[PDB]
Amino acid sequence: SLFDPSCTGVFDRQLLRRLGRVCDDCFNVFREPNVATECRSNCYNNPVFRQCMAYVVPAHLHNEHRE
Amino acid sequence: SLFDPSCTGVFDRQLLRRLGRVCDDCFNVFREPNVATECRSNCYNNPVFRQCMAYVVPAHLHNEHREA
Prior knowledge:
- Chain A: It comes from Penaeus japonicus.
- The structure is a homodimer.
- Helix content of chain A is 54%, strand content 0%.
- By secondary structure, chain A is mostly helical.
- Chains A and B meet through helix 1 and helix 3 of A and helix 1 and helix 3 of B.
């Protein structure tokens, strides 16, 4: 929904899903579901997503396998 | 190089390029070249990249135009 409180006005659901993969790659989201939910909050503008990106991006940059 | 001080040990160049587009989409990098360079520093773990994230990602989320 364009009125989803977590991030309003999303017309590019492809990018929303890509960003979600940062959260999913950060930890087992089912074992820490409240953290996983916070990771999605505010269009991903939140401290959990930023910290996850700090772990996941360098791990992926260091790995020869592609996205 | 693997020993690039800006980010060592990079084997996934294509991901490094994609992150660079966040910086390029954030402002005219040629007109603020020192800010553009800081944006890339430390494997993109820096305040300029993070603030650019916060402008560029919402802009792209609100625009139907896909990135791939």
